């Protein structure tokens, strides 16, 4: 029942060295398990970036042998990843995911030691640009007759002008997810995004139920929960 | 290397084949993943043909030589998706490499209409100094669509930035259209209206200022 959570910058300097971590939960690093990375640019596929055993043993991508290092640290029980030189071309999705003990080589004796990776991380977006980072400014779409539609009404919130990629959207710190739907962002003129979250609701729950939602901008560090009540 | 079809289509309660092509899989048990938008990847099948405890019987998968193939028997609309093979090379220390991905279109999905909500701006967002018109477009299938504004009766394009459609999990489309105002625009005016055109039908939402 291994979980695997991704923890990175956001915003990567050009020819800045990026570096991520993976929380391991329930299940321990100190085990016999191929701690490893992949990653994923914008519309593209995926990219097998490198491994580790909990010993310190690695095997890497050869077409990122010279830029990448992978550590294991077994007392915060969490394993890493450092790209250095980093490009726009290291735009990507970063995910860690866990791989079984293998033996995929022919000198192997058993062969039934296959080579796969079955849980992975949620990812973690890295974005690589010179440009400067810029938290979100976050409003309440208020539900009203306008808004509602027979039994059904709804409510929102609007996460204008951040940077970089993205912000992720809850409600009621997680205490609400039927009905939910964060749009995907826009990207404005001025090179700034902008993305609306919308929570569908029985419009006889309006004025007497609380929502929130809970909006997070991790590569500035900012989180916003705005109170979202009816006009 | 390791070759697929980038994309693949099928109609739903029929059969469909994913082949991977490349050197890497002769002697090799291939495993294969899928991705649907805005998730990670899923494990489908490893060392050949096993399926894990979650995924459902009807993917399989097989290999002889230089070929692999992940089937979908009598496929659903939850099946469309990205998949991609994977091995690792027989040279070097062998390391990981994957296919360029198989998108999956399940063809004889329902269509359907687009479901407009319009915003307001908010009361804080104007004592800020600033007004965005918000019109969310969810549910529409397939996903293809044009939105145009009117102030009043009469058309507004300065200001106008406008999504392309993504996909939902129900395997519909959503998208959304924002208008930029200045407070003492949004207080004067009589209305404001999005158009949302889909598959030769418009739906029309309209805000006032009150």
């Known amino acids: 029942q291994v979980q695997l959570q991704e923890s990175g910058p956001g915003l990567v300097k050009p020819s800045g060295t990026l570096s991520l971590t993976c929380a391991v939960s329930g299940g321990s690093i100190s085990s016999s398990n191929w701690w490893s990375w992949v990653r994923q640019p914008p519309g593209k596929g995926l990219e097998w970036i490198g491994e580790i055993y909990h010993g310190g043993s690695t095997n890497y991508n050869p077409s990122l042998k010279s830029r990448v290092t992978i550590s294991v640290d077994k007392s915060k029980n969490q394993f890493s990843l450092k790209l250095s030189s980093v490009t726009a071309a290291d735009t990507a999705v970063y995910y860690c995911?866990?791989?079984?003990?293998?033996?995929?080589?022919?000198?192997?004796?058993?062969?039934?030691?296959?080579?796969?990776?079955?849980?992975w991380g949620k990812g973690t977006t890295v974005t690589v640009s010179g440009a400067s980072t810029k938290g979100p400014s976050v409003f309440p779409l208020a539900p009203s007759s306008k808004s509602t539609s027979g039994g059904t009404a709804a409510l929102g919130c609007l996460v204008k002008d951040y940077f970089p990629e993205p912000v992720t959207v809850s409600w009621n710190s997680g205490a609400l997810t039927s009905g939910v739907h964060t749009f995907p962002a826009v990207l404005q003129s001025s090179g700034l995004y902008s993305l609306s979250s919308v929570v569908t609701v029985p419009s006889s729950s309006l004025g007497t139920q609380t929502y929130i939602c809970n909006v997070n901008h991790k590569p500035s560090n900012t989180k916003v929960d705005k109170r979202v009540e009816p006009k | 290397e390791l070759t697929q079809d980038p994309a693949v289509s099928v109609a739903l309660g029929q059969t469909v084949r994913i082949t991977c092509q490349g050197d890497s899989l002769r002697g090799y048990y291939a495993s294969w993943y899928q991705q649907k938008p805005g998730q990670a990847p899923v494990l489908v099948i490893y060392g050949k043909n096993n399926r894990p405890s979650g995924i459902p019987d009807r993917f399989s998968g097989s290999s002889s030589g230089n070929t692999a193939s992940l089937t979908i028997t009598g496929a659903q609309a939850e099946d469309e998706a990205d998949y991609y093979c994977?091995?690792?090379?027989?040279?070097?220390?062998?390391?990981?490499?994957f296919g360029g991905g198989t998108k999956l279109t399940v063809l004889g999905q329902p269509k359907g209409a687009p479901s407009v909500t319009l915003f307001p701006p908010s009361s804080e967002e104007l004592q800020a100094n600033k007004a965005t018109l918000v019109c969310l477009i969810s549910d529409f299938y397939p996903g293809a669509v044009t939105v145009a504004w009117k102030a009043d009766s009469s058309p507004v394009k300065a200001g106008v930035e406008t999504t392309t459609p993504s996909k939902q999990s129900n395997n519909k489309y959503a998208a959304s259209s924002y208008l930029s105002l200045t407070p003492e625009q949004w207080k004067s005016h009589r209305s404001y209206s999005c158009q949302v055109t889909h598959e030769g039908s418009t739906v029309e939402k309209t805000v006032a200022p009150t």
């Open positions: 995911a866990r791989a079984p003990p293998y033996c995929t080589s022919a000198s192997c004796p058993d062969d039934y030691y296959y080579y796969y990776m079955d849980v």
């Open positions: 994977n091995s690792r090379d027989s040279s070097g220390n062998h390391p990981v490499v």
